[PDB]
């Protein structure tokens, strides 16, 4: 019943900016910006996911 | 090449005094075949004047109903000048066509005139006419395309913006040459239904007249 809102600049619902609300070791729920999920890459000739290659960020 | 040799051969052999053996003038018949079966489709294609030329000298002879080819000729000629919208292949058929009648004295078979009746240039219809039923289907589904790269869908989009603008400046210039076509037609037409009429042929009047009737109001 404890409301949260925006950790940084950004004040919109833009794809850029998510939230997820976590309880902290403090008692107390808190906000916290979700970075976008990884991509599988796919194959050059088909477009299908590559299997046994590990999904992560381009520069990860 | 091998096309131009052979549209040359067949005029070569269309040409036949009807005084010669009957093998010579059965040769030039079976020519004046092939000509008119070949223009069905070759009429957008290099050296058209020659065949339309010979099939017109067929056409304009002072006697075709021993011809047993002229109905045919007739009803190809009729066929492409109905078909024909823009206005350039009449407008091709036209000059020659006056070109001839000029060396005749505008000598014709009523019949043979009647091709120009025909003329779909000089013609208007209806801004909303109903085509006949055409369906297709309208896009390839979402769930059923083809892969292709990101270079590839740029390319696509590429040839796709130039196809646009290429079509569109198609139309203008389709739309700005179909009116230049009619007025040269219209000149034409008339030139030669004016000095029918001051030469007096009784057996033309009638088609004549109903040419006027017909391309009148298109005039200026
Ligand atoms: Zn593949």
Do not use: W
Not at chain 1, 5 to 33: C, D, E, M, W
Not at chain 2, 14 to 30: D, E, F
Not at chain 2, 55 to 78: A, G, M, N, V, Y
């Amino acid at each position: 019943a404890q409301r949260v809102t925006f950790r940084r600049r950004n004040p919109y619902n833009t794809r850029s900016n998510k939230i997820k609300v976590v309880k902290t070791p403090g008692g107390i729920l808190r906000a916290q910006h979700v970075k976008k999920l990884a991509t599988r890459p796919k194959c050059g000739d088909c477009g299908s996911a590559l299997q046994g290659i590990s999904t992560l960020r381009p520069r990860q | 090449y091998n096309y131009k040799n052979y549209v040359g051969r067949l005029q070569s052999l269309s040409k036949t005094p009807s005084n010669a053996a009957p093998i010579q003038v059965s040769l030039g018949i079976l020519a004046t075949q092939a000509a008119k079966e070949l223009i069905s489709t070759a009429s957008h294609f290099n050296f058209r004047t020659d065949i339309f030329t010979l099939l017109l000298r067929r056409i304009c002879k002072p006697r075709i109903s021993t011809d047993p080819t002229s109905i045919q000729i007739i009803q190809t000629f009729e066929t492409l000048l109905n078909e024909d919208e823009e206005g350039s292949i009449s407008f091709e058929i036209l000059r020659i066509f006056n070109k001839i009648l000029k060396t005749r004295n505008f000598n014709i078979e009523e019949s043979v005139l009647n091709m120009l009746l025909s003329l779909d240039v000089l013609h208007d219809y209806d801004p909303n006419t109903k085509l006949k039923g055409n369906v297709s289907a309208p896009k390839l589904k979402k769930k059923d395309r083809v892969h292709l790269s990101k270079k590839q869908r740029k390319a696509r989009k590429e040839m796709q913006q130039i196809e646009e603008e290429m079509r569109n400046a198609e139309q203008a210039v389709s739309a700005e040459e179909r009116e230049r076509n009619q007025s040269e037609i219209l000149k034409i037409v008339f030139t030669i239904y004016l000095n029918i009429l001051k030469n007096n042929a009784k057996t033309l009047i009638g088609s004549v007249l109903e040419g006027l009737t017909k391309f009148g109001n298109m005039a200026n």
